[PDB]
């Protein structure tokens with residue numbers, strides 16, 4: 001379909017322009033607590049929170065390129081971004097997972113193993129985030145699919161305090177339709193692929209809810225090392 005093809009192309013381009021892929025980056029490592037579990041490696045947390053600020057900027061750039069996002073009220077654009085920020089950041093870091101080395105790669109090439117991701121701040125959430133990354137791999141998702149899943153996660157009408165939830169639901173409707181027809185065309189062998197992918201958003205919300213609780217825990221324990229929160233940055 002030309003209207004569907006055009007929508008897929010726009011979302012694939014919005015994602016590619018705001019997300020450097022694992023293959024494109026020059027991986028580098030750090031010796032910082034690489035083989036020792038610690039409650040919090042402040043040097044790892046410092047690098048990690050600086051990378052997060054840059055990634056939140058890219059997410060906002062991605063959101064603004066989604067057809068119709070900027071037509072929503074400013075209050076609703078802020079509400080959607082605050083609610084999906086952790087979900088999108090989780091999806092982005094899990095997209096750069098290397099299973100044999102059990103590492104994830106940041107947008108500047110920084111490559112941390114499971115112990116280091118735990119020490120950088122993930123703590124009790126590490127195994128859940130790494131399990132999600134492991135579940136993504138067999139889906140063999142391309143840029144169009146990752147972009148569309150990110151857009152579906154963002155443009156969600158069930159978020160608390162939305163001024164126009166039906167409008168947001170209507171904006172989400174062509175994205176779901178595009179992903180359905182796209183996965184059908186590209187993978188006709190597996191017709192269960194589309195609901196398997198939407199199930200990942202359900203998994204993402206659960207992990208994101210736990211993540212928000214960890215943000216609060218970290219704000220309590222290390223307030224002086226906390227960068228401005230997601231809510232603070234987007235406002």
Ligand SMILES: CC(C)(C)c1cccc(-c2cc(-c3ccc(C(=O)O)cc3)nn2-c2ccc(S(C)(=O)=O)cc2)c1
Nearest residue numbers: 051052055089092093106107121122211214215229230
């Ligand atoms: C457990 C917990 C640690 C809370 C957590 C939970 C879920 C997601 C994150 C998270 C992922 C990224 C990220 C950074 C860079 C890239 C890139 O380079 O591709 C990709 C992703 N950042 N990030 C994050 C969020 C808030 C904050 S905070 C408290 O607001 O300081 C700091 C960091 C973190």
